[PDB]
Amino acid sequence: SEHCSHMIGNGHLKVLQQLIDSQMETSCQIAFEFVDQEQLDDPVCYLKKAFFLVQDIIDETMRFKDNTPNANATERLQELSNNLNSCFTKDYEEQNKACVRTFHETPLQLLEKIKNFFNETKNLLEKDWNIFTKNCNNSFAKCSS
Amino acid sequence: ADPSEHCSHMIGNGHLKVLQQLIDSQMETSCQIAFEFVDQEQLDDPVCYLKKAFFLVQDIIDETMRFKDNTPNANATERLQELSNNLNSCFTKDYEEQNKACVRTFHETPLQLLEKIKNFFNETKNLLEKDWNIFTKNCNNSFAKCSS
Amino acid sequence: APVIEPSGPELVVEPGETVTLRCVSNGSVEWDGPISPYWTLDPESPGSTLTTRNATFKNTGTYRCTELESTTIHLYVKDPAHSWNLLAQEVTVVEGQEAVLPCLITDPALKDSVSLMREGGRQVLRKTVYFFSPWRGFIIRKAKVLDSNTYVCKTMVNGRESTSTGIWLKVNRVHPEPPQIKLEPSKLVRIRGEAAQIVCSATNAEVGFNVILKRGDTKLEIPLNSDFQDNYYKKVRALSLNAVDFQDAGIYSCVASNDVGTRTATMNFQVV
Ligand SMILES: *[C@@H]1O[C@H](CO)[C@@H](O[C@H]2O[C@H](CO)[C@@H](O)[C@H](O)[C@H]2NC(C)=O)[C@H](O)[C@H]1NC(C)=O
Numbered sequence: 001s002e003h004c005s006h007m008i009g010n011g012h013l014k015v016l017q018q019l020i021d022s023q024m025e026t027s028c029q030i031a032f033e034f035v036d037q038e039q040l041d042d043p044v045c046y047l048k049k050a051f052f053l054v055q056d057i058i059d060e061t062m063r064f065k066d067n068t069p070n071a072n073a074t075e076r077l078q079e080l081s082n083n084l085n086s087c088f089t090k091d092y093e094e095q096n097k098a099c100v101r102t103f104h105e106t107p108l109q110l111l112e113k114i115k116n117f118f119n120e121t122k123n124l125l126e127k128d129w130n131i132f133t134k135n136c137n138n139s140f141a142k143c144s145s
Numbered sequence: 146a147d148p149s150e151h152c153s154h155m156i157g158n159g160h161l162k163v164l165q166q167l168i169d170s171q172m173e174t175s176c177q178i179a180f181e182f183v184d185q186e187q188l189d190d191p192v193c194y195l196k197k198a199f200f201l202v203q204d205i206i207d208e209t210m211r212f213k214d215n216t217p218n219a220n221a222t223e224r225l226q227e228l229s230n231n232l233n234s235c236f237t238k239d240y241e242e243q244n245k246a247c248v249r250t251f252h253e254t255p256l257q258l259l260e261k262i263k264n265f266f267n268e269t270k271n272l273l274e275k276d277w278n279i280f281t282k283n284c285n286n287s288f289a290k291c292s293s
Numbered sequence: 294a295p296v297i298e299p300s301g302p303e304l305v306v307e308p309g310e311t312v313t314l315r316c317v318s319n320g321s322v323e324w325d326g327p328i329s330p331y332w333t334l335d336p337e338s339p340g341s342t343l344t345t346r347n348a349t350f351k352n353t354g355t356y357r358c359t360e361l362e363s364t365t366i367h368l369y370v371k372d373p374a375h376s377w378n379l380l381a382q383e384v385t386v387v388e389g390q391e392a393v394l395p396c397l398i399t400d401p402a403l404k405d406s407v408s409l410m411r412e413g414g415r416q417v418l419r420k421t422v423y424f425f426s427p428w429r430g431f432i433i434r435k436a437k438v439l440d441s442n443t444y445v446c447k448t449m450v451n452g453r454e455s456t457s458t459g460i461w462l463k464v465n466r467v468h469p470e471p472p473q474i475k476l477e478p479s480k481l482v483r484i485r486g487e488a489a490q491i492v493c494s495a496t497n498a499e500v501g502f503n504v505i506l507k508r509g510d511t512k513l514e515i516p517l518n519s520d521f522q523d524n525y526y527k528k529v530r531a532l533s534l535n536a537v538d539f540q541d542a543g544i545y546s547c548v549a550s551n552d553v554g555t556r557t558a559t560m561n562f563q564v565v
Pocket residue numbers: 319320
C-alpha cells in the first residue's frame with residue numbers, strides 16, 4: 001500500500017471543483033446515505049466509514065450526461081475511487097449499516113461532502129500511507145441507534 | 146408598432162449553444178423545484194403560449210438560474226438575461242385584468258425547468274425568423290379562455 | 294462660499310406660492326440648476342436670483358450657486374397630484390458607472406413610501422442594486438448592461454398611488470462605436486475563368502446594424518448570416534462564385550453601420 005501515498009492529487013481535485021462551480025444553486029435537495037458526525041467523532045474513522053458511501057455516491061448520484069466534461073470528471077473521479085480500495089483496510093463489519101444515516105440536502109452540500117473526503121484523504125495519505133490502516137471497531141461500536 | 150426586422154436575429158445559435166452547455170453540465174437529480182409557468186392545459190395556442198411565457202421566462206432566469214459569479218454558466222445566464230430584455234421590443238403587451246391568467250405553479254426537476262427555458266428560446270427564435278411581426282398578435286381571446 | 298436666501302438645506306412650499314432664490318455674493322456668481330423654463334433669472338451685481346410667481350412641482354430640485362470668479366439649496370414643491378418631478382426621461386451610462394434616475398420626490402414626507410419598478414407593476418431585477426436619494430431620485434451604482442430598461446417611480450400612500458412616466462435607461466459595456474469589419478481575403482487574383490469566394494463580416498455588441506458587400510458602387514445581393522458568439526453579434530455576407538467573368542473583377546467594399554456610424558473596408562479582385 002505504498003503507491004497509495006501518491007494516489008489522489010490536484011489533477012482531479014480541481015476537476016471536482018469545476019464540477020461544483022458549474023452547478024445551479026436551486027432549492028433542490030436530494031436524499032442520500034452518508035456518515036452521521038452525530039455518532040462519529042474520530043476523523044480517522046470518518047474517512048473510513050465514508051469510503052464505501054462515497055463510492056456509492058460517485059456511482060449512483062453523481063450522474064452527468066455522457067462524454068461531457070463533468071461526465072469525464074466523474075469517470076476519473078471513479079477510477080480513483082476504485083484504485084483507492086488499495087489503501088483502506090476493511091474492519092469488523094457486523095451491524096453493517098452502523099454509523100450511517102440518510103441525508104436530505106442540496107446537491108451543493110453532497111458534492112462538498114465528496115469534496116472534503118478526497119481532501120482529508122489526499123491529506124492524511126500524504127502524511128502517511130499506512131493511515132486508513134487503523135482499526136475502527138472501537139469507533140463504530142460507539143454509533144448508537 | 147415596435148418590433149423591428151432585427152428581431153429575426155436577436156436570438157442566435159450561440160445563445161442556444163451556450164444554454165445547452167449550461168444544461169449539459171447540470172447533474173441529473175432527483176429533485177423538484179417550484180416555479181411559475183403556463184399550463185398548456187389552459188393555453189394551447191402556440192404564439193400566445195410564448196407571449197405569455199416571455200415574462201415568466203424572464204423571471205425564471207432572474208430568480209432561479211443562480212450560478213457563482215464569473216462562472217461560465219453565470220456569464221451565459223447573464224447573456225440570456227440580456228437577451229430577454231432586448232426581446233421586449235418584440236412582444237406587444239396584451240390586455241387582461243387577471244394578470245395571473247393562464248399561469249400555474251409547477252413542481253419539476255431543474256433540468257426540466259431549463260428545458261422549458263430552452264424550448265422558449267428555440268420556438269421564439271424559429272417564429273421570429275419566419276416573421277418578426279409575429280408576437281404582435283392580439284392574444285386577448287386566448288387568455289380569456291384560461292380558467293381557474 | 295456664497296450665501297443663499299431664503300436659506301438653509303431644504304425649502305418646502307405649497308404650489309402657486311411665489312419663491313425667490315437669492316444668491317448673496319460679491320459681484321458675479323452663477324446658478325447651476327435643474328431649471329428652465331420654469332424659473333426666471335436675473336444675474337446682476339449682488340449675485341443672481343431665481344424667481345417664480347407660481348411654484349409648481351416642476352420647480353422641485355437642487356439649486357447650486359457658485360462663485361463665478363459653492364452653496365446649495367434643494368426645493369420641494371409639495372403637490373399631491375404629483376409626487377414626482379422628472380428631470381429627464383432617458384439616461385445613458387457606461388458599465389460599472391453610477392446611474393441616476395432623476396425621479397425627484399416632491400414631498401419629504403413621502404421619503405418612506407417610495408419604490409423603484411419596471412413597467413406593468415413588475416419588480417426590478419434582483420441583480421439590480423440601487424437605493425433612494427430624496428434629492429436625486431433612485432440610483433443604480435455600478436450599472437450592468439442588464440439593468441438597461443424602462444423604470445417607473447411609485448409612491449403608494451394608503452391606497453393612493455402616484456407613478457412617474459417611464460425613464461428609459463441604457464447601459465453600454467463600452468462606448469458605442471461603428472461595427473468592426475473583416476474582408477477575407479484582403480486581396481485576391483484567382484483568375485481562372487472560374488472558382489472564387491469573398492467573405493465580408495461585421496461585429497457589434499447589439500443586433501441593430503447592417504452589413505453589405507459591394508463591387509465598385511454596386512451593392513450585391515447576398516443572403517445574410519447572423520449569430521451571437523462571445524458577447525457580440527456577427528453578420529456575414531459571403532460571396533460565392535463558380536466561374537468568374539471580367540465584370541466580377543474590381544474593388545469590393547464591406548460596409549457596416551449602426552446608430553453611431555459606418556465602417557468600411559476595401560479589397561481588390563483581379564482576373565485576366
Ligand atoms: C469680495 O470681498 C472679498 C473680501 O473683501 C474680496 O477679496 C479681496 O480681499 C481683500 C480686499 O480687497 C484683498 O486684499 C484680496 O486680494 C481679495 N481676496 C482674494 C485673494 O481674492 C473680493 O475681491 C470681493 N469680490 C469681488 C471680486 O468683488
